[PDB]
Amino acid sequence: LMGPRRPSVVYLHNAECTGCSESVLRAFEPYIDTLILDTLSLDYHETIMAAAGDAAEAALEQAVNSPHGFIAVVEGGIPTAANGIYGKVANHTMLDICSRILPKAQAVIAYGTCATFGGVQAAKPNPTGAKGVNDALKHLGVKAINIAGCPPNPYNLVGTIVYYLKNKAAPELDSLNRPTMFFGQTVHEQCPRLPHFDAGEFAPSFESEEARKGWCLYELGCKGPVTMNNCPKIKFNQTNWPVDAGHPCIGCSEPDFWDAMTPFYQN
Amino acid sequence: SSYSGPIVVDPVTRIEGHLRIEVEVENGKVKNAYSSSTLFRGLEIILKGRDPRDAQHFTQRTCGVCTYTHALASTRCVDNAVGVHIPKNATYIRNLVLGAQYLHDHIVHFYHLHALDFVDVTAALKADPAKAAKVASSISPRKTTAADLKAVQDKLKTFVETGQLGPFTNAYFLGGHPAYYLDPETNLIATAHYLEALRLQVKAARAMAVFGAKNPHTQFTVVGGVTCYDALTPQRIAEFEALWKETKAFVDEVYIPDLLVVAAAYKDWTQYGGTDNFITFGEFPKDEYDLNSRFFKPGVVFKRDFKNIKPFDKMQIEEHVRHSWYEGAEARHPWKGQTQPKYTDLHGDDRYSWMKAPRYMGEPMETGPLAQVLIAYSQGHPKVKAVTDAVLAKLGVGPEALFSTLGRTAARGIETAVIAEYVGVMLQEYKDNIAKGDNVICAPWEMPKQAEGVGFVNAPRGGLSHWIRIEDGKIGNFQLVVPSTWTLGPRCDKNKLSPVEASLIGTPVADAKRPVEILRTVHSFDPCIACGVH
Numbered sequence: 001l002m003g004p005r006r007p008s009v010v011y012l013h014n015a016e017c018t019g020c021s022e023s024v025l026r027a028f029e030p031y032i033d034t035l036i037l038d039t040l041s042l043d044y045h046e047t048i049m050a051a052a053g054d055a056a057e058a059a060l061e062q063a064v065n066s067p068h069g070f071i072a073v074v075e076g077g078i079p080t081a082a083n084g085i086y087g088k089v090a091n092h093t094m095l096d097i098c099s100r101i102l103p104k105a106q107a108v109i110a111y112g113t114c115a116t117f118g119g120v121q122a123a124k125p126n127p128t129g130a131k132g133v134n135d136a137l138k139h140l141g142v143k144a145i146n147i148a149g150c151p152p153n154p155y156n157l158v159g160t161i162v163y164y165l166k167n168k169a170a171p172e173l174d175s176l177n178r179p180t181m182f183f184g185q186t187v188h189e190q191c192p193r194l195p196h197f198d199a200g201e202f203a204p205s206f207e208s209e210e211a212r213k214g215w216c217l218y219e220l221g222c223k224g225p226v227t228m229n230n231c232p233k234i235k236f237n238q239t240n241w242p243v244d245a246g247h248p249c250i251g252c253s254e255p256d257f258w259d260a261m262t263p264f265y266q267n
Numbered sequence: 268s269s270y271s272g273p274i275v276v277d278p279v280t281r282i283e284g285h286l287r288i289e290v291e292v293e294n295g296k297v298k299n300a301y302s303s304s305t306l307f308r309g310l311e312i313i314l315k316g317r318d319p320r321d322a323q324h325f326t327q328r329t330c331g332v333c334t335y336t337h338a339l340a341s342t343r344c345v346d347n348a349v350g351v352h353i354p355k356n357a358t359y360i361r362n363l364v365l366g367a368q369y370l371h372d373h374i375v376h377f378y379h380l381h382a383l384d385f386v387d388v389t390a391a392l393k394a395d396p397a398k399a400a401k402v403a404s405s406i407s408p409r410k411t412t413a414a415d416l417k418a419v420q421d422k423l424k425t426f427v428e429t430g431q432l433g434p435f436t437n438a439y440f441l442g443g444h445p446a447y448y449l450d451p452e453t454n455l456i457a458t459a460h461y462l463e464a465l466r467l468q469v470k471a472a473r474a475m476a477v478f479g480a481k482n483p484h485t486q487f488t489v490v491g492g493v494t495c496y497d498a499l500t501p502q503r504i505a506e507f508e509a510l511w512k513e514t515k516a517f518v519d520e521v522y523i524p525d526l527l528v529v530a531a532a533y534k535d536w537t538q539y540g541g542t543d544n545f546i547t548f549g550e551f552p553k554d555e556y557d558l559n560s561r562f563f564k565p566g567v568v569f570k571r572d573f574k575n576i577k578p579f580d581k582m583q584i585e586e587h588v589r590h591s592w593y594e595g596a597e598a599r600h601p602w603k604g605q606t607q608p609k610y611t612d613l614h615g616d617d618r619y620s621w622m623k624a625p626r627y628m629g630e631p632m633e634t635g636p637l638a639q640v641l642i643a644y645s646q647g648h649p650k651v652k653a654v655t656d657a658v659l660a661k662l663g664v665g666p667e668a669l670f671s672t673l674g675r676t677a678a679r680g681i682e683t684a685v686i687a688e689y690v691g692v693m694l695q696e697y698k699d700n701i702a703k704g705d706n707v708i709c710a711p712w713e714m715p716k717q718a719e720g721v722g723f724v725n726a727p728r729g730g731l732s733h734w735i736r737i738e739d740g741k742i743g744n745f746q747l748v749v750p751s752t753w754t755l756g757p758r759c760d761k762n763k764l765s766p767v768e769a770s771l772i773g774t775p776v777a778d779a780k781r782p783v784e785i786l787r788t789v790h791s792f793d794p795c796i797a798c799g800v801h
């Protein structure tokens with residue numbers, strides 16, 4: 001599947017909605033075809049790989065045991081309740097799969113809030129005992145770089161990989177193990193509506209003339225002030241981001257945000 | 268004789284989510300099948316007690332392939348429970364973002380999920396690019412030259428020569444495979460367009476973010492309408508329109524001609540993968556409270572009797588658990604739904620999936636593009652009739668050919684082409700409404716302490732419904748019944764095979780170690796297991 005010239009990436013899917021995989025397909029300059037053909041060797045990825053079944057399992061084993069080394073990118077939280085039963089691939093639990101593979105990686109990137117911090121299936125009451133990769137695999141020494149968001153900006157994944165390939169090391173990480181080059185600012189300090197916030201100019205409802213005129217969404221629940229991400233700067237799909245679409249930030253790059261930031265329309 | 272014995276495909280790749288397919292084969296043909304979904308998250312359990320306004324944000328994370336669709340279904344569901352009638356412009360904007368979703372979703376499905384079942388990418392290397400360009404220019408108004416295709420060939424050659432086959436590692440076509448039929452030049456055209464589609468889908472998705480903030484996981488819907496005042500501006504409308512026009516050209520000039528060339532080469536696939544019963548909820552309303560106001564209308568068909576389309580009665584849905592990993596055996600209407608996980612391992616107590624088994628008047632129902640297309644056709648939908656007739660005539664087959672794996676795949680293209688054209692109509696109506704001075708996009712509403720609501724979306728995989736019971740102004744019960752649940756859920760307590768299980772009976776398997784024929788039928792339904800199980 002690999003060896004030589006391009007670095008090998010093993011991409012795993014645990015308890016996930018595949019929005020993180022879709023976000024990588026939106027990669028722009030470089031685009032995903034450049035990424036797969038030129039930059040990297042994508043050696044396992046259930047969403048787009050040709051092989052299925054046994055042939056897919058063999059592709060995975062061949063990539064993880066390669067003498068050339070691999071990078072792991074992990075999407076989704078790891079269900080740990082009832083001995084990992086709530087999530088299996090090839091009749092192996094996701095907990096076991098990640099336990100065996102991720103300590104062999106030269107580096108691990110947890111991609112999306114589910115893989116970094118547990119995510120949507122970890123929200124109360126967490127029936128499947130879902131955990132982020134580093135929480136689940138602490139005992140095994142795994143320290144994944146966390147690229148948070150639901151889904152993250154794919155700019156942040158490609159930038160982290162390129163850094164890593166250049167520098168042979170992780171970039172500076174924050175206390176949640178997220179790269180400070182992308183997560184070092186609140187989305188609020190970057191927001192174009194900040195002058196309205198400063199002036200106490202808040203929209204009181206989505207139908208109001210204040211909302212029409214672009215006033216601040218804090219009274220309508222915006223979690224920009226407590227959320228670290230580069231949304232207003234990079235934007236999404238080269239064109240927009242939640243509060244420029246008139247909707248509050250729901251805090252989706254923060255741990256436990258499903259429970260910490262709810263109700264989403266209150267502050 | 269041919270292979271006899273079990274085949275297991277786990278993971279089924281090139282789908283969303285975690286699917287295990289088990290079949291028994293006898294003399295080279297499938298005689299029994301089980302659809303086993305192997306991840307549970309439990310979003311319905313997690314929603315209990317929360318603010319109904321929050322539901323769309325959690326349920327959107329049911330699935331990022333069919334992103335937006337669940338936000339739309341939950342917002343339609345809470346809109347309905349609250350009794351708000353959203354403004355005309357919110358209906359247009361929501362409808363336009365959903366139309367864009369179908370085009371992105373179906374283009375990616377055909378090329379990036381389905382086509383490696385039918386295209387041998389490495390055989391493209393032996394192709395004559397001049398011959399291939401002539402074939403490509405004969406099937407499309409778009410002109411393709413030898414140099415165009417050589418560039419693709421050159422790039423693939425450098426890739427394969429490195430020995431790092433990446434996503435093509437251990438492909439079922441490597442080395443050749445008796446069930447792969449395309450000549451080198453057609454494999455090159457398809458492979459070129461696979462690569463092209465990787466960049467085109469960026470634009471198709473961007474169209475959703477113009478109004479909807481971002482893709483994946485849009486963020487512009489609220490109870491009572493939408494939030495995106497910028498979507499009223501000529502600039503955003505122009506940006507959307509340019510992306511839609513380019514996406515539609517790709518559908519019309521690249522996807523449908525490729526679909527037709529591959530279908531013609533695989534005409535034997537009209538003989539496998541048929542199903543009996545069809546359900547569809549309709550989509551693109553003029554009135555949020557009347558399904559029959561939708562551009563595609565709801566309907567129910569049993570045993571392929573399209574002369575007797577039955578009205579859709581939402582009270583006749585029940586979800587079975589007897590063959591699923593939940594407590595007990597009692598089927599439930601989703602306003603009385605139960606999500607009580609209880610795992611027994613594969614086939615323990617005859618249970619083998621985390622999906623429930625929805626049944627309509629007790630019957631297993633295919634939903635998705637083939638249901639939407641055949642029912643609209645049989646309702647006299649002029650646009651659907653015009654392009655499915657042309658597809659049938661181009662392929663030289665009769666309408667019976669549609670009840671198959673090939674016909675399902677063709678129906679996905681037909682619906683894409685029809686929706687791509689209708690998005691223009693919706694855009695024009697939207698523009699006209701703004702021009703009349705209607706700039707309203709959100710309506711006020713009040714939360715009742717007690718209420719029931721339901722929201723209906725016909726998603727790219729079929730009929731989606733979200734069901735809420737509001738108690739003390741909070742979520743008392745929230746149930747998702749999702750298209751892949753209908754199509755890929757397991758057997759019910761009457762032991763009826765689901766559409767995917769039943770469709771697999773009869774499948775030939777040339778090589779049990781590379782069972783591409785099972786994948787061809789399973790992928791034709793476009794499974795989404797995060798959707799089906801939630």
Ligand code: SF4
Nearest residue numbers: 017019112113114150
């Ligand atoms: S982080 Fe969000 S988008 Fe990514 S897999 Fe989890 S729920 Fe889906």
Ligand code: SF4
Nearest residue numbers: 191194216217222224
């Ligand atoms: S809209 Fe949100 S991120 Fe912007 S200024 Fe107001 S609170 Fe901050």
Ligand code: F3S
Nearest residue numbers: 229231249250251252
């Ligand atoms: S909801 Fe998420 S995508 Fe950015 S604007 Fe807020 S961190």
Ligand SMILES: [Mg+2]
Nearest residue numbers: 746747748801
């Ligand atoms: Mg459900």
